[PDB]
Design a protein around this nucleic acid. Structure first.
Ligand SMILES: Nc1ncnc2c1ncn2[C@@H]1O[C@H](COP(=O)(O)OP(=O)(O)OP(=O)(O)O)[C@@H](O)[C@H]1O
Ligand SMILES: Nc1ncnc2c1ncn2[C@@H]1O[C@H](COP(=O)(O)OP(=O)(O)OP(=O)(O)O)[C@@H](O)[C@H]1O
Ligand SMILES: Nc1ncnc2c1ncn2[C@@H]1O[C@H](COP(=O)(O)OP(=O)(O)OP(=O)(O)O)[C@@H](O)[C@H]1O
Ligand SMILES: Nc1ncnc2c1ncn2[C@@H]1O[C@H](COP(=O)(O)OP(=O)(O)OP(=O)(O)O)[C@@H](O)[C@H]1O
Ligand SMILES: Nc1ncnc2c1ncn2[C@@H]1O[C@H](COP(=O)(O)OP(=O)(O)OP(=O)(O)O)[C@@H](O)[C@H]1O
Lengths: 362, 362, 362, 362, 362
DNA sequence: TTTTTTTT
C-alpha cells in the first residue's frame, strides 16, 4: 500500500497552495492520529481541521515515503497550471469576480469568530470613507465599471488637488480591491525605458504626481513629467498594443492597462488634458482630518485605506443588482449581518460623528 | 535491513538543525558505540549526548548507505517546512513565546551545574546595560509591544548616533532576544534583490550604517542607502507583500519584516524621516566606557551583547502580567531564582558603579 | 565484488582531503601494486606510501566503477561536514591546539629520515626573525592569545612601514601558523561581496598594504583601502554576525574572523585607529639586507616567511607551560631535539653573524 | 557484452585528451575496421594510428552505447585529476623536466623520416635568435632558473623597447617553451576578475604591451595598464596565496605564477619598477631587418616564435650538466644528432650572413 | 523492438544537422509512410526525400519512444564532435576543399533536373562580376591562396572606394565562398571585447566599413574604428596566439583568422597601412548601373552576392590543375557541362552587353 | 538558475 499522489493533489487544489514547502509542512501534520488531533480540538485553522480526518491514512504513508518533495512539486504544478489556464481564458469581469472573493474571504480574518478586529471599527472606517467624497459610493461604482469595460480613450481619470489631499491614499485603498501599481514620469527620458516597463501585466495602474515645467509658478517643482507625458500618447488611449521593458530581460508586448493619474496643481496643455475622461480636485477637509486625529483606531487597524472597508462601504450602499450575479448570495449574507448587527442609528451616529469631525466610534 | 529516514528526520526536528552539512556531520558521530562514547561520558554537547544511545543502531546502518546527502536533504526540508507552517499560522505573540522558551531553556543550562555562567557577572551585565540607557527596561518593552502589534511606520525605529554610542550593542542583544536578521542596501539595487531573500520568514530585520549620499557635507562618506530607501518609501511603513527572491529556490510573497535603521548620523530624506515610531538617537556616554574599562567579564564573555542579558533584565524588572500569558510559570520560577540571590542593594551596588564609571563587581 | 564507499571515506578523513579531483587522483594511484610502487619505494609522499598497501585492494575495484565521481563526492562531503561540526563546537583553544599538531606532524617528516630539510637553515631563519624586532617571540605570543580570546572591537593589529621593511614577510609566517586567508581591500567598494565570502569558517584574515589617500606626498599612490576599511567597521568590531557569499550556494552566517592589516605610511582615519588594538612600525635596516645577500638559501627555501620557522622560535624561547596541555608532551620532545642538536654557542654564533651582516653561516 | 570504460580511460590518459568532444570524436573514429583505416594507412595522425588497432573492438561496442557522453565524462575527469595531483606534488624542476620531455617527443616527429621540418631552417632560426641580444643563451638559462626558483619579490622581468624591436617574438618562444598564458591588463577594472582567472595552474604568465597613461611625448598612446597594474602589486610579489575566479565557478586559491611584462617605452612608478628583478632593452637593428627580409621562410613557418627554436638553442650552447638529471640522456642524443648534421663552420657561416644583413642561407 | 540510436546518429551525420530541435522535427516527419508522403512526391526538400524511405521503420518506433530528446542530444553531440576533431586536425587546404564540395553539391541541385535555377542567368551573373574589377579571376585566385597559406603579416587585404561601388557585394560573395563572419569594430572600446568573440574558430573574417575620423572634410562621418584597429596589430599580423571570449563562456586562445577590411576613402595611418598585403580600389561605373537597371533578375535573385557565382567564375576561367587534387574530377565534369551549355561566343556577347551598359541578355 | 551579462 502506497501514497496516493491523487489525494495530495486534491488537497493542494482545495487549499490553492502553490508553495512546495508550505504544502509539505502542512500535509505532514495529518500523520498523527486524527481522532485526538488537538489542532482540530482547538479549531485553529480550517485548512487543517476540515481535512485531517479525510487525509489521515494517506498522510501516515506519506510520512514514511522516501520521495516527499517530488510528490509535492507535482501537486504545486497542478495549482499553478490552473492559474495559468484561467489567466488565459477568463474575462476581466470574471477576474473581478475573483477580486471580490479575494477580499470577501479576508473579511473573515477580522470578523470571523477570531474577531481580530472589531467590525464596528470598520464601520467607523466605512463612515469616514463615505464622508470623504461627494456621492462617494457612486464615484466608486463609476470608476469600477469604467475599469471593467476598459473602453479605449475613455479610460483615465485625473486626481488633481493640493498636497496632502488623500488622493493617493484613496487610490491605494482602491488598488487594494484589485491590485495595481503606481509609477513615476518625472525621471529623465532614459530612465523612463525600464520605468514604463514596470507596468507589465498589472490589472490596474496609477501615476505619481508630476514634476512639470510650469508648476514652479506655484513652486510646484518644474521637472520633466508634463512634457514627457504629452509625448506618451498611445499608452493612455489604449487603442493598440505597445512594447514594454525589463532590465537584463526581454521586451513584452500588450495593450497598456487602464488607471489613474495623481497630480498637484500644475498647468497642462489641452492635448494632455484631452487624454482624460475626467478630473477630480481633492482637498484636505476640516472635520474629516480632525476626525481621524480623533478616531485614530481607524488609522491603527489599517482600516482607513482598506479595500475591505471599501467593500463594506459597497455592500452597504449598493443594491444586490450591482454585484457579480452568483456572488450576490454571499453579498446578501454580508448584507444580512451588516444590517442586523448594525442599526441605522449606529451608522447615523458614526457618520454624524465624522460630521462633527470627532471620534467616529463614540 | 534498512536506514530509517524517519528516525533521521526526528533528530533534525528535535535538534531544530536546519543545515544539511551540520546535520550530516552530527549524525555520523553516532556510528560509534554510545556504550563507550567519550563525548557521552564527557557530557560536552547535549545535541550529542542526549541522543547517541537512541540513534546508535540506525546510525550504524546510515553509515553504510550510498544516499547519505539525500536523506539529509529530506530531513532538512522537514525542519524548514515546519518553520514555514509556523511562519504563516502563528500569532506574533506565540512566536515571541517560542523564542523566549528557547532562551529560558538555555539559561536552565547556563546556571545549571554544567553551564558554568556566573549569574552575578550576567547581572553585572544587566546593571551595565540598564545604565547604557536608564529608560531601557521600559523602552525595550515598548519595542517588543510595537513589534508584536507590527503597526505600520511604527513598524520601524531609528538608531542614529556616532561610533561608540552603543547603537550596535543594543541592536545586537535585541536581535538576539528576538529572532531576526541584519541587512544592507548601500548600492544600486539592479542585481541586488536576492539580498531581501534574507527577509523571508523573519520576525524582525535590522539595518545599520545604510549610507547617505551627501553626508560628506559632515564627513560621512556618501553611499546609496538613503537614496534606495527614500525611493522604496513603503517598507518602513510596510504595505506591499513583495515576493521575496531566493537563489535556485522558491520566492515568498510577504510584507517585509518590521525593524530599525541604525546609522552614524547621515543627512536623511524628509519623506523617509517620518516613517518610525521614533526618529531617535544615541549619544556616547564616556563613563560607560569607564565602567567597561573597569568591568571586563562583561565584554570578554560578551554579556553586554546578549539577548540573554535583556531577558534577565526583563525577568528582574517587569511584572509577570506584562509577559506572554501562558509561559508565566517559568517567569515566576526565574524571578524567584533571581530575587533569591539578588537584593536591590547588591543590584544597585552594580548599577551606580556603572552610572559613575566605576567597576561593576564590588 | 563491490566498492567499499566506507574505505574511500576513511582515506578522505585520514588525509583531510577536500577537493574531489585531488581525492580522485590520489585514490586512483592505489590501483597498481604497492608491492612495486616506485613512489612507495622512493618514500616520496606520505599521503601515498602510508596508505597504498591498505587501500590497494579496494582501489582495484574502484578502478572499474562507473560511479566514481559520486563515490568521491560523498567522501568529500564527510570531510566537509567534520569541519563545520568543528567550527560550531570547538573552542578556539582546541582549534589552535589541533593546528599545532598538524604542523608538528609536518616537522616530523621534514626532519625525519627522508628528512629533506636542514634544521640548521631553519634555525638561522629563527635568529634572523628574532633579530627583526626587540622581544619578537613575546609579540608572537601576544598576537596568538589575542586571536584565541577574540575579544570584540579589540581584535585587529596593523603593521606600518616603508616597502621592503618586512611587514608582509612577518604576516605570511603568521598566516601559515594559524591558517587563514589574505584578502584585498584596495578595490571598488562594490567588489568586496564575493571577496569576503572566502572568510567562511576561517580562523584568521590578513589585508595587505592598504592604499590610503594623499600619500603621494610620500610617493604612495592613493586608493581604496582606507575607504573600504572605514566602511566595514562592524567586521573589525566583531560584535555581530554577517552573511557571506558563495556561488551556486546559499549564504552562511557567522562572526567575521580577526586578523592583521599592513600599510605603507598612508593617512589614517582615527575611527580605524580606535579599532586597531595595536600597531607595529617596521624600518628597513641594511645589515639584514647584507645578511640576506650572503644567505640566499633562506629566501630560496622560503624559510623566513614560513610559520614553521615561527613555531621553532616559540619552542626555543617559551616555557613548556605556555602551550596547551596535550601538546606539552610533544613540545617537550621538540625542546629535547633542539638542545641536543644545537649548542647555545652555535645559535649565538648564528645570531652574531646576523648582527654583523655577514652570511648567517661561517 | 559491454563497453570497457577502462580502455577509454587508458586512451584519454595516453593521449592526455581533456576535451570531452575531442575525446569522443577521436574515439568514435576507431569503430571502422582497422585493417582498411585510411588514416592509419596514410599515417597522418599518431594519436589515431598508434591506437586504432588496439581500441577497435571496444570502439564498436561503444558505438552502440546509449550512454556515450557519460563514459567520456568519466575519462576526461581522470586526466584532469592527474593534472591537479601533479600541480600539488611535483617540484618546479620536475614540471619543467616533464615539459621538456614533451617538446623532445615532438621534435622526434618533426625531424623524423616523417615530419616536414628542415633542421637547417630551424637551426637558421637559432642563428637569428642568438644574434638578437648579447649572450642570448646565457640569458635564457638565467630566466629558466628564475622561473624554477620562483623567489618571492624577485620573479618578474621587464622587456621594453621601441615597437618592432622583438619583444613579443621572444615572449612567444619563452611561453611556448615553458607553457603558460598571455594576459591583457589594459582593461577596465571589472573584467580583470575573469581575466586574471586564466592564470590558474599555469607555469608562466606574460603581460602584453602594458600601456602607460601619459608620456605621449614619446608618441605613446595612453591607457590604464600601468595604473591598473600597480594595484595588483601583491600578485607580482607572490609572497602569499591569492584567490582566483572563473565564470560560473567558485574561487581557486594559489600563488600567482611568475612571468614577463612587455611594454613600449613608458615611464614607471618606483613601487612597480622595484618589483622587476631584471630589465632588458630591445633595440631595432637594421641588419636584422634586411636579413629577415631576405629569409622570410623564418616568418612563414613561425620558426622564430617557437619554443622548439629556444630548446634547440639551449641544446647547442649549454653543457649537458645543466639539464635535469633524467633528460641528460636524450640531451646527449640530440647533441650527437646536431653535431653530426652541422659543423661549427656551417653554423658560424649562418651567423656571419645575419651580421651582414644578407640572407641567412648560402 | 527498440529504437536504433545509431540510425539517428547516421542521419545527423548525413545531414550535418547540429540543432537538436531541427534534428528532432525532421526525424518525426518520417513516421508517415514515405510511399504517399507528399514531401517525397513533390521532391521538395532533399533532406527529406532522399532519406524518408530508409528511416521509415526506425522513425515509427522513435515516435513511440519516451526518451526522444535524449536520443537527439547524443546524435547532435556526435556531429559537434566531428567538427571539433576537424578543427584541430585538417589542413587549411582540406578545409577549403571540403567547403568547395558543399557548394558543388548545391549546384548539382540548383541546375539539376529538379533545378529551380537557370544556369544562363547565373552565367550572366559571372559576366557582371568579371567586369567589376580588372583581372577579376586572377584577383580571386590570389586571395584564396593568401587565405590558405595564412602567412604572418601577409594576411589582410583592404577594399576602399566611394559608397555604392560594390565592396560589400564582393566581401559577401567571398565570405560565402570561404565561410566566415562579419565584424563591426566601430563600437566603443568596451563591448568590442565580446564582438571579437564571434571570430572563434572561423576560417575568415570581414571588418565591415571601418569609420575613420576627419573625413568629414569630405563629408565622411567620423567614428572609432580606425583607432581601434591600430590597437589590434597582432590580431592582423597573425604571428602570435590571442585570447577570445563569448557570453557565458570562459576564454579560448588561437591565431586570429585572416580577413578583409573595407572602408570609404578616409585617410589611413601608415601604422595601419603596413598591415595589408594589398589594397584594391573600387570605382563607381555607370554602365554597370545601367546594366543592373535592365537585368534586374541579377539583384532580385541575389545572384551577384553569391559565392556560387564566384565558384562558377573559377570553374570557367581557371586551369584544372589549380584545384585540389580530389575535386579535379568534379571540376572537369562541371567545365564539360559549361562548355556544352555555352559557346565562348555567347559568353563574350554577354560581356560585350555589360560593357555597353545595356541588358545582359540577347 | 545562477551567473554573467546588462546596466552604469
Ligand atoms: N479631506 C481629508 N480628510 C482627512 N484627512 C485627509 C484629507 N485629505 C487628506 N488627508 C490626509 O492626508 C494624508 C495624505 O494623503 P494622500 O497621500 O492620499 O494625499 P495626496 O493629495 O495624494 O498627497 P500629495 O499630493 O501631497 O503627495 C492622509 O493621511 C490623509 O488622511
Ligand atoms: N554610550 C557609550 N559610551 C561610551 N562607550 C560606549 C557607548 N556605547 C558603546 N560603547 C563602547 O564603545 C564600543 C562600541 O560600542 P557600539 O558598537 O555599541 O557603538 P556604536 O555607536 O553602535 O558604534 P559603531 O557605529 O562604531 O559600530 C564598545 O567597546 C562599547 O563598549
Ligand atoms: N626590515 C627589513 N630590512 C631590510 N630588508 C628587509 C626588511 N624586511 C624585509 N626586507 C627585504 O624586503 C623583502 C620584502 O619584504 P616585505 O614584502 O615583507 O616588505 P614590506 O614592507 O611588507 O613590503 P610591501 O609593502 O611591498 O608588501 C624581503 O624579502 C627582504 O628581502
Ligand atoms: N631588433 C629588431 N630589429 C629590427 N626588426 C625587428 C627587430 N625585432 C623584431 N623585428 C621585426 O619586427 C617585427 C615585430 O616584432 P615583435 O613581433 O616582437 O613586435 P614588437 O612591436 O617589437 O612587440 P610588441 O607587440 O610586444 O610591442 C618582427 O616580426 C620583425 O620583422
Ligand atoms: N562598381 C559599381 N558601379 C556602380 N554601381 C555599383 C557598383 N558596384 C555596385 N553598384 C551598385 O551599388 C549597389 C550597392 O553595392 P554595395 O552594397 O556592394 O556597395 P558598397 O559601396 O560596397 O557599400 P557599403 O560600403 O555601404 O557596404 C549595388 O546593388 C549596385 O546597384
Amino acid at each position: 500500500k502506497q501514497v496516493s499522489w491523487k489525494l495530495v493533489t486534491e488537497y493542494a487544489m482545495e487549499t490553492k497552495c502553490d508553495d512546495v514547502l508550505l504544502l509539505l509542512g502542512m500535509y505532514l501534520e495529518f500523520q498523527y492520529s486524527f481522532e485526538m488531533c488537538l489542532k482540530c480540538i482547538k479549531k485553529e485553522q480550517p485548512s487543517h481541521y476540515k481535512y485531517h480526518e479525510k487525509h489521515y491514512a494517506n498522510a501516515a504513508i506519506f510520512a514514511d515515503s522516501k520521495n516527499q518533495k517530488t510528490i509535492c512539486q507535482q501537486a504545486v504544478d497542478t495549482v499553478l497550471a490552473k492559474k495559468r489556464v484561467d489567466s488565459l481564458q477568463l474575462t476581466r469581469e470574471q477576474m473581478l469576480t475573483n477580486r471580490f472573493n479575494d477580499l470577501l474571504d479576508r473579511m473573515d480574518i477580522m470578523f470571523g469568530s477570531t474577531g481580530s478586529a472589531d467590525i464596528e471599527e470598520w464601520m467607523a472606517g466605512v463612515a469616514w470613507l463615505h464622508c470623504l467624497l461627494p456621492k462617494m459610493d457612486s464615484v466608486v461604482y463609476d470608476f469600477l465599471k469604467c475599469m471593467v469595460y476598459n473602453i479605449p480613450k475613455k479610460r483615465y481619470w485625473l486626481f488633481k488637488g493640493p498636497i496632502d489631499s488623500g488622493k493617493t491614499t484613496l487610490a491605494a485603498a482602491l488598488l487594494e480591491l484589485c491590485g495595481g501599481k503606481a509609477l513615476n514620469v518625472n525621471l529623465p527620458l532614459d530612465r523612463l525605458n525600464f520605468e514604463l516597463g514596470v507596468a507589465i501585466d498589472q490589472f490596474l495602474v496609477v501615476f505619481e504626481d508630476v514634476k512639470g515645467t510650469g508648476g514652479e509658478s506655484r513652486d510646484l517643482p518644474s521637472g520633466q513629467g508634463i512634457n514627457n507625458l504629452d509625448n506618451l500618447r498611445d499608452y493612455l488611449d489604449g487603442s493598440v498594443k505597445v512594447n514594454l521593458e525589463k532590465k537584463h530581460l526581454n521586451k513584452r508586448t500588450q495593450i497598456f492597462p487602464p488607471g489613474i493619474v495623481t497630480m498637484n496643481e500644475y498647468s497642462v496643455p489641452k492635448t494632455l488634458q484631452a487624454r482624460f475622461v475626467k478630473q477630480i480636485d481633492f482637498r484636505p477637509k476640516d472635520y474629516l482630518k480632525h476626525c481621524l486625529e480623533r478616531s485614530e483606531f481607524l488609522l491603527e487597524k489599517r482600516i482607513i485605506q482598506s479595500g475591505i472597508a471599501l467593500l463594506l462601504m459597497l455592500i452597504w450602499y449598493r443594491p444586490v443588482a450591482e454585484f457579480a450575479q452568483s456572488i450576490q448570495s454571499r453579498i446578501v449574507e454580508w448584507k444580512e449581518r451588516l444590517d442586523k448587527e448594525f442599526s441605522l442609528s449606529v451608522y447615523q451616529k458614526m457618520k454624524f460623528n465624522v460630521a462633527m469631525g470627532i471620534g467616529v466610534l463614540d
